[PDB]
Short mmCIF file of C-alpha atoms and ligand atoms in Angstrom, two decimals:
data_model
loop_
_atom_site.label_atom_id
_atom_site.label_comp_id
_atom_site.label_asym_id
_atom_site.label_seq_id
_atom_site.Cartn_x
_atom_site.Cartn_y
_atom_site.Cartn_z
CA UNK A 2 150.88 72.25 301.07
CA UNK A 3 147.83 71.07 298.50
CA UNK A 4 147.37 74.56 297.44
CA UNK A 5 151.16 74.58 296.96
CA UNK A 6 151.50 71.47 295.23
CA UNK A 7 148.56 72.33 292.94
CA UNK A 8 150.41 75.82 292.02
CA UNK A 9 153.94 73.98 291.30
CA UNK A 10 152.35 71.02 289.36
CA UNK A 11 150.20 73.90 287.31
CA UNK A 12 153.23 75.94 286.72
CA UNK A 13 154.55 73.03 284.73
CA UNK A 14 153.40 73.00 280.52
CA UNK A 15 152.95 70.05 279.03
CA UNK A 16 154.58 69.75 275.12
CA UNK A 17 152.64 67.25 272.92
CA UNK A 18 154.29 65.39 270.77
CA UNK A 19 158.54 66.11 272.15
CA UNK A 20 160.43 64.98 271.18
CA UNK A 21 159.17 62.04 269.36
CA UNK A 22 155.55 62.11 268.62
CA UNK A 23 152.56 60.95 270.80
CA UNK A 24 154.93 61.60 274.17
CA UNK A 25 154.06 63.88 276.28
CA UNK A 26 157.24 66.01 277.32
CA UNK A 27 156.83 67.79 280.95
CA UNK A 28 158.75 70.89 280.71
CA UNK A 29 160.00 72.42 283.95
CA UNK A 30 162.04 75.48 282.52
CA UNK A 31 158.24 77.35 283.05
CA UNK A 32 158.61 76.24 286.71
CA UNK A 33 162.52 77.99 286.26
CA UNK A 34 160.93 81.53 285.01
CA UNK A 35 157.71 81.46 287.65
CA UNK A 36 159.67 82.92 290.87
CA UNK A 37 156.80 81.71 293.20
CA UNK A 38 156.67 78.11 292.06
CA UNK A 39 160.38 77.60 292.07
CA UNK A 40 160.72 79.08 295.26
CA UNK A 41 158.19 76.69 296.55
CA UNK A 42 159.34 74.13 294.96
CA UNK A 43 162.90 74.32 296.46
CA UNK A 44 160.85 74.96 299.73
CA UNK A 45 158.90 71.74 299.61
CA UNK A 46 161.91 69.83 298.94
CA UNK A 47 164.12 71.21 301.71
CA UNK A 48 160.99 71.33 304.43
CA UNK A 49 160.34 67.54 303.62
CA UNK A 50 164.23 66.68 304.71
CA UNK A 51 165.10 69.26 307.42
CA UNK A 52 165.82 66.96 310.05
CA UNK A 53 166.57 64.04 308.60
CA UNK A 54 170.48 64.25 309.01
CA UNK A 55 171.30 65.24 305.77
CA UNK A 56 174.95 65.99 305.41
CA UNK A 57 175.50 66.49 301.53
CA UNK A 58 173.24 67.11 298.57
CA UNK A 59 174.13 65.24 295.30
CA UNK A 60 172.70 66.02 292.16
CA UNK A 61 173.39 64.81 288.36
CA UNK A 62 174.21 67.33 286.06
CA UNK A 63 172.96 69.37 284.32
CA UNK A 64 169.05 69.43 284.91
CA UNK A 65 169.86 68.33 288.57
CA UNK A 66 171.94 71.25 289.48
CA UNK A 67 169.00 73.18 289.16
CA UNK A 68 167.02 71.27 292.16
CA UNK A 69 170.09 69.61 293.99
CA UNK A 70 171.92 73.11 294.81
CA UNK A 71 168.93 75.44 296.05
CA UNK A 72 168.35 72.50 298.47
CA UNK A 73 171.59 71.91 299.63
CA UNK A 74 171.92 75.90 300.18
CA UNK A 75 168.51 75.90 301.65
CA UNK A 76 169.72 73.28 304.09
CA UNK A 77 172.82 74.75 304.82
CA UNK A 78 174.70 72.05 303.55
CA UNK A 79 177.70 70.86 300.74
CA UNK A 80 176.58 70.54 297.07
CA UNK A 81 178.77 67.74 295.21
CA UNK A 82 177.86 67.36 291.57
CA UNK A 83 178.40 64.00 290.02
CA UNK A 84 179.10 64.83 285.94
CA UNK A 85 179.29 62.82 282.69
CA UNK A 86 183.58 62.60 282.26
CA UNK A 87 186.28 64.85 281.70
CA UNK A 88 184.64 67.83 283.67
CA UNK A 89 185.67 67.12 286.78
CA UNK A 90 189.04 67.99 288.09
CA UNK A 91 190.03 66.41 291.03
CA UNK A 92 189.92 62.46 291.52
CA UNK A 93 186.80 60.69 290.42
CA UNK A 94 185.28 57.31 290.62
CA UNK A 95 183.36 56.37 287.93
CA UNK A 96 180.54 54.15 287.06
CA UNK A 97 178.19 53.36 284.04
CA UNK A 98 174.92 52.71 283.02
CA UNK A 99 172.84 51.41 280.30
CA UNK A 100 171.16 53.99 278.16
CA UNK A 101 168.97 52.85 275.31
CA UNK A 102 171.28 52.80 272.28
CA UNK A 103 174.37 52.17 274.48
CA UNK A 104 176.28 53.26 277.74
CA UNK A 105 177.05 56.20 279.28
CA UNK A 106 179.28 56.82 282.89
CA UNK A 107 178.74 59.62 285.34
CA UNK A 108 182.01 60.69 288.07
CA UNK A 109 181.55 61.70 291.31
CA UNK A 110 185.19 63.73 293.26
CA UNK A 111 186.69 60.81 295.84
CA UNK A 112 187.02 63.95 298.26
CA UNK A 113 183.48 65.37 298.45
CA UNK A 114 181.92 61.95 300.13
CA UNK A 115 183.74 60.02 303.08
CA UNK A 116 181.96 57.42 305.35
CA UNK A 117 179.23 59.20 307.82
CA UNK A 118 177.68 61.17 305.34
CA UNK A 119 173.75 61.09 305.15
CA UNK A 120 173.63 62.25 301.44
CA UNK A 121 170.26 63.67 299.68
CA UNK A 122 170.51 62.49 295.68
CA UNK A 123 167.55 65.75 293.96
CA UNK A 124 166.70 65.22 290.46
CA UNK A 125 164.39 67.66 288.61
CA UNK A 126 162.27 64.38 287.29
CA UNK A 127 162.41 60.68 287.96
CA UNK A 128 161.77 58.73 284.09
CA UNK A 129 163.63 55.66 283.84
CA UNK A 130 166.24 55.83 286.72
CA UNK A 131 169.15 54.91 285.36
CA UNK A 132 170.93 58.09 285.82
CA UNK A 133 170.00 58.08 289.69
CA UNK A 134 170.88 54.24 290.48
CA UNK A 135 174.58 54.84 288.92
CA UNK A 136 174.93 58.40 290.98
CA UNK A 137 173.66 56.07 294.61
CA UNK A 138 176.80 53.37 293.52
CA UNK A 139 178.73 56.09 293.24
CA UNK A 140 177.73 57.84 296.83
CA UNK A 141 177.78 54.08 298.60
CA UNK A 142 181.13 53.22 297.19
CA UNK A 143 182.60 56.12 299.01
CA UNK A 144 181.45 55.19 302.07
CA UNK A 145 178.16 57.35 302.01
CA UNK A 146 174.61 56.91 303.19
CA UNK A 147 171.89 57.01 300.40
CA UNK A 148 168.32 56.65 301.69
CA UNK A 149 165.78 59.05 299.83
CA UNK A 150 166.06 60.64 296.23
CA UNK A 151 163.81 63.82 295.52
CA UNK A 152 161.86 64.59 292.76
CA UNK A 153 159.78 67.73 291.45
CA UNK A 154 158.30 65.34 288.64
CA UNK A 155 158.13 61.12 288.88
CA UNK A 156 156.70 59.57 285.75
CA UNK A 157 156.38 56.02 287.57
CA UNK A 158 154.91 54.18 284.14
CA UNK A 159 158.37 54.65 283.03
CA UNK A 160 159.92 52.22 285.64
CA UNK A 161 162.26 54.28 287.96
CA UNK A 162 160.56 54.88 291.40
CA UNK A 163 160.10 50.89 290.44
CA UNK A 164 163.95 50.66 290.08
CA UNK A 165 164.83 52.76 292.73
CA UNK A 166 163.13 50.74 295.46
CA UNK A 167 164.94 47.48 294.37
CA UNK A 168 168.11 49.39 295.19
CA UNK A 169 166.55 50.22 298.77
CA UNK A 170 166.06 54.06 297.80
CA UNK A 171 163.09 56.28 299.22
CA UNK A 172 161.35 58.17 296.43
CA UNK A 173 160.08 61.56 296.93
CA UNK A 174 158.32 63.07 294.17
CA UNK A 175 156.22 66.56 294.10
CA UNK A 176 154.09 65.66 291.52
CA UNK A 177 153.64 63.02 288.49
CA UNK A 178 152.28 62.26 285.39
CA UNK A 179 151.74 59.54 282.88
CA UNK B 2 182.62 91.93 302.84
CA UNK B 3 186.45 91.98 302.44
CA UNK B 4 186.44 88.82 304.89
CA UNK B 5 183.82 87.09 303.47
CA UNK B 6 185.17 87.65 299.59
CA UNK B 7 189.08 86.32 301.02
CA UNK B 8 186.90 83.18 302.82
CA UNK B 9 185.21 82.91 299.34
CA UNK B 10 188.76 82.58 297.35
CA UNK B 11 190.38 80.65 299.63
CA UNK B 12 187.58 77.77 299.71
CA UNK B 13 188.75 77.66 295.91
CA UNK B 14 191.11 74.86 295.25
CA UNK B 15 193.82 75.20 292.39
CA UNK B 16 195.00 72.33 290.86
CA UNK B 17 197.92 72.84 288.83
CA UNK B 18 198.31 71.39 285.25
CA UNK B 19 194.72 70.67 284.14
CA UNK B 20 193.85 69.49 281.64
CA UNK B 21 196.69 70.19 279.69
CA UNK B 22 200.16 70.90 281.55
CA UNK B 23 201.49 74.38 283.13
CA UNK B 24 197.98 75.49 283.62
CA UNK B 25 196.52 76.38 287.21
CA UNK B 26 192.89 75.03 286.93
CA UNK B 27 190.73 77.09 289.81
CA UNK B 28 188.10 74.15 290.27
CA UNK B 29 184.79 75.55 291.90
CA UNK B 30 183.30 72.44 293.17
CA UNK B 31 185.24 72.43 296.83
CA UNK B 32 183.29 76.40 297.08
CA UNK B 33 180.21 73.84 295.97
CA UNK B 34 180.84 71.38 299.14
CA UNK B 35 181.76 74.16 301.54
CA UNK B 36 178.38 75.26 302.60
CA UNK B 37 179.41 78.81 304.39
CA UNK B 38 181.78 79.91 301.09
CA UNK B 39 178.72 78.58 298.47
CA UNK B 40 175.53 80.47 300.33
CA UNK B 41 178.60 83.72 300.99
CA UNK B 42 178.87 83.96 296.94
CA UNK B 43 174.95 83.75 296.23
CA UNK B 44 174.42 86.06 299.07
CA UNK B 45 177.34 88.84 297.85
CA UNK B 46 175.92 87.96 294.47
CA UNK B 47 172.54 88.95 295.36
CA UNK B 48 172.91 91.84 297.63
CA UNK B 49 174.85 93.46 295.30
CA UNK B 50 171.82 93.29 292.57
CA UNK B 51 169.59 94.19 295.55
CA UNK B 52 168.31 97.22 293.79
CA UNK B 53 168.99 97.19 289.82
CA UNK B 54 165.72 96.15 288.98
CA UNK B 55 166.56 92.68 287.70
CA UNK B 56 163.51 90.73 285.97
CA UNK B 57 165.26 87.45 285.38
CA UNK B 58 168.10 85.86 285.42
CA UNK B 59 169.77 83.96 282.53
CA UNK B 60 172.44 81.12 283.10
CA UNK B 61 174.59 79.00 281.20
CA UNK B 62 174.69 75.32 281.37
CA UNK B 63 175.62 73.56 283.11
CA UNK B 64 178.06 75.59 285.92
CA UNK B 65 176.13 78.54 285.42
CA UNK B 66 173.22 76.93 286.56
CA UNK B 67 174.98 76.61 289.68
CA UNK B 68 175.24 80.21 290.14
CA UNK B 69 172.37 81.97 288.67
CA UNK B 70 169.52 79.78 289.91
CA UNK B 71 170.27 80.61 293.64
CA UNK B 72 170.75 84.33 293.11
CA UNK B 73 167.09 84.37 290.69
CA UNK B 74 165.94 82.63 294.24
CA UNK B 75 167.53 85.45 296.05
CA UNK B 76 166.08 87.83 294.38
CA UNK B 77 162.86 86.75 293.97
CA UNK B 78 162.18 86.24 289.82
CA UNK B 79 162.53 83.97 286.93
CA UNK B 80 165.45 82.21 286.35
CA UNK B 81 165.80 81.16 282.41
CA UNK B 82 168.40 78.55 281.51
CA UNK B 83 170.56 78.98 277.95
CA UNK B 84 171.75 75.52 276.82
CA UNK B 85 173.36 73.28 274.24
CA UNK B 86 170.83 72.64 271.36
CA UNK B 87 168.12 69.75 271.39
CA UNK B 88 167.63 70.24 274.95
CA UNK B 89 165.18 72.92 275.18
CA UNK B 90 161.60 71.98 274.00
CA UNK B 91 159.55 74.91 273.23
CA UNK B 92 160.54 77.79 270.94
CA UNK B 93 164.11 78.58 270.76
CA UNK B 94 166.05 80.69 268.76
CA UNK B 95 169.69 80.34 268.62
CA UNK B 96 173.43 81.90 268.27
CA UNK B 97 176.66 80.69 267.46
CA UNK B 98 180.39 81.01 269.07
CA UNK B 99 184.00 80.81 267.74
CA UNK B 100 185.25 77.88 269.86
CA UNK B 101 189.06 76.70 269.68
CA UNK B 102 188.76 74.20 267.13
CA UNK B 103 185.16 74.85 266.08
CA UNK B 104 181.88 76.30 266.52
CA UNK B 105 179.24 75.57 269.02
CA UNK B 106 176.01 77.26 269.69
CA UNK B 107 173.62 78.06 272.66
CA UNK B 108 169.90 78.18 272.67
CA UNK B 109 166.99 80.35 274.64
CA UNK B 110 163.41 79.90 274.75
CA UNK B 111 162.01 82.54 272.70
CA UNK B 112 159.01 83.09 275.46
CA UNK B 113 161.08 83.50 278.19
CA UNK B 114 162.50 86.78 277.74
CA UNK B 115 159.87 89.95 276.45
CA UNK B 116 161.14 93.65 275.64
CA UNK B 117 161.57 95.28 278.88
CA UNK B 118 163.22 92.54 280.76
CA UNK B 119 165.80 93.86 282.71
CA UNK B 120 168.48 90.50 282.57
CA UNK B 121 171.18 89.42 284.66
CA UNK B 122 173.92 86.61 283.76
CA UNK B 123 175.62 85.04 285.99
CA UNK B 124 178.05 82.05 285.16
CA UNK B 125 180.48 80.67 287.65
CA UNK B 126 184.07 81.65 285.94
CA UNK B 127 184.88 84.09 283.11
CA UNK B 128 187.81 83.01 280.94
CA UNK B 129 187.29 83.78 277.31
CA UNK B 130 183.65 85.34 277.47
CA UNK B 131 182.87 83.53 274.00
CA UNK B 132 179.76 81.90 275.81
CA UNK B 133 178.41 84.99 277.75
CA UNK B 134 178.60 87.07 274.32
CA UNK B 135 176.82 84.46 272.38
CA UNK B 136 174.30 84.57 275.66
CA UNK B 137 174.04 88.08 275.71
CA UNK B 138 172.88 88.00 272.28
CA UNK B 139 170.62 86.20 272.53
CA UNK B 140 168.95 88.06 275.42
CA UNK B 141 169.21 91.25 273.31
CA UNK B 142 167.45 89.65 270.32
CA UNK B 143 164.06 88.87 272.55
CA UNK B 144 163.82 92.51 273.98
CA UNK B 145 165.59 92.36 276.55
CA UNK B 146 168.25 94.38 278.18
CA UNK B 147 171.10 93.29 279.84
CA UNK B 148 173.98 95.47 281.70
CA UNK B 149 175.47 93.56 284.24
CA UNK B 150 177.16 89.94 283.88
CA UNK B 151 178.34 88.82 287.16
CA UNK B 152 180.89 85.71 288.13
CA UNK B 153 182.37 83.62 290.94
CA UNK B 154 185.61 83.86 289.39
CA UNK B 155 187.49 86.25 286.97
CA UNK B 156 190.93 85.04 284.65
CA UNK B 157 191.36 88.57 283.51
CA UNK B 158 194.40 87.79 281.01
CA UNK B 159 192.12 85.06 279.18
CA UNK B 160 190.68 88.34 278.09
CA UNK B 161 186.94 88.19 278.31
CA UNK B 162 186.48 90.91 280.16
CA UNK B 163 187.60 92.69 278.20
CA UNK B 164 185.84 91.24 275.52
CA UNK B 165 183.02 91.94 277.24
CA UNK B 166 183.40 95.48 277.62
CA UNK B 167 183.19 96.08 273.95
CA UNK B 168 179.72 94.18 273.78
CA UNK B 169 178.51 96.78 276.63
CA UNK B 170 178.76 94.60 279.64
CA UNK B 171 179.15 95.33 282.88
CA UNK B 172 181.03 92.11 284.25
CA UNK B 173 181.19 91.81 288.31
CA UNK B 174 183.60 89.10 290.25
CA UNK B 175 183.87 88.38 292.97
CA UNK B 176 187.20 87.10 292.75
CA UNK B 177 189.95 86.82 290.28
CA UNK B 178 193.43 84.95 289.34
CA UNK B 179 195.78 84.95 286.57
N1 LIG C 2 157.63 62.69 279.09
C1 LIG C 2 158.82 63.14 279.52
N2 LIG C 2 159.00 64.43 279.91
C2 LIG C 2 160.18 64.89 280.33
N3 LIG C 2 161.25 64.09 280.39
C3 LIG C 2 161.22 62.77 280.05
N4 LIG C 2 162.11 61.77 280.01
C4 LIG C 2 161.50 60.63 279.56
N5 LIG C 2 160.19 60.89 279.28
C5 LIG C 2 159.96 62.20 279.57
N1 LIG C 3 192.57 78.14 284.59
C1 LIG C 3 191.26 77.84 284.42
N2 LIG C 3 190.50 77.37 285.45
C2 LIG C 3 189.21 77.06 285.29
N3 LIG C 3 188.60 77.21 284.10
C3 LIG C 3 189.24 77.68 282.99
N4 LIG C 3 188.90 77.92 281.72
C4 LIG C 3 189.97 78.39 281.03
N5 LIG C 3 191.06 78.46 281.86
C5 LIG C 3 190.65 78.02 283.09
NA1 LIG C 4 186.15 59.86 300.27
NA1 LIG C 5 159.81 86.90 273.60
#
């Protein structure tokens, strides 16, 4: 699994200076194009979770779709994609979250969680959290179980592993950075 | 194959008049919770691919993603995301599409795809094909050859099949409605 890790984490370039300047932007479209370390990477995640109940996979789009879905198809179970609003067409809840120059909501379909579910939130990267804690409100309010959040990248200087544990969330991340 | 392609369209819900009135809205997402019908399409997908000689595969975001990340995991190579602009980071160049009321345009790291590249598409639904052109081009402009677009769903008399004919595609559904 170190030799794995080590090939996934390597697989992933680093952009100086993205887009602001000084920050140092962790790209994982290379991961996307290198057929070894995204297969590995969707096998880490799934291998980590495969018996821990998991009912439903959620993931946030757009970045998230790219994680969240292999999973969920890796371990045989529903995808439900919670969107920003107006994309989805059935009935949504919605809820909100600060961003940093004002507020944005994400929806999640009524339908696709009911009370029982043991539901697996994947992310491609963990910054700030903000995204993640309004997509567990959303998965609780319908009666579902939240208990761990995956990650192929957690930058924890930014705050959100921080932010996610005050909600009572399990982080798993493959690899991080500062 | 005929029973899994009839399980396939009939784990797709319609919901009639979305957005706007009159229209029958084919919504994807209860194919996304249904976890027999969602690994069915990648696998159909995939197998029928088997042996084209695909080098990557190039989505759309964000429902594309959906789509073509599982079957680049299916068969083995690079999948390469095409997105809204000032979301990639490295190189991009970029192409333009006639939307309704305006003009948008879709982005592709300029790395990703080298002359020789044999590329697939895949997107989830093909209604107007203004998006999978704009795509294509792009693909065509780095090198790289592409024959085959391939979707969950086809809306024939939205015309971009057609559409997509006189570009030189391919296109491949797996099911279709009017
Ligand atoms: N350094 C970084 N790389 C990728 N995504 C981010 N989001 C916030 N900071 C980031
Ligand atoms: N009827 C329909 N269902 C889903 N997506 C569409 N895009 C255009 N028409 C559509
Ligand atoms: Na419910
Ligand atoms: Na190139």
């Amino acid at each position: 699994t170190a030799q794995q890790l080590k090939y996934i984490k390597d697989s992933i370039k680093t952009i100086p200076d993205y887009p602001k300047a000084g920050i140092l932007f962790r790209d994982v479209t290379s991961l996307l194009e290198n057929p070894k370390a995204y297969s590995a990477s969707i096998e880490l995640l799934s291998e980590h979770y495969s018996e821990s109940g998991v009912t439903k996979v959620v993931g946030t789009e757009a970045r998230g779709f790219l994680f969240g879905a292999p999973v969920a198809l890796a371990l045989g179970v529903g995808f439900v994609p919670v969107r920003k609003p107006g994309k989805l067409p059935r009935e949504t809840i919605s809820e909100s979250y600060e961003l940093e120059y004002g507020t944005d909501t994400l929806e999640i379909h009524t339908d696709s969680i009911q009370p029982g579910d043991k539901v697996l939130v994947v992310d491609d990267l963990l910054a700030t959290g903000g995204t993640i804690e309004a997509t567990v409100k959303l998965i609780r309010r319908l009666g579902g179980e939240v208990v761990h959040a995956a990650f192929i990248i957690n930058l924890p200087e930014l705050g959100g592993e921080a932010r996610l544990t005050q909600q009572g969330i399990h982080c798993y991340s493959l690899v991080s950075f500062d």
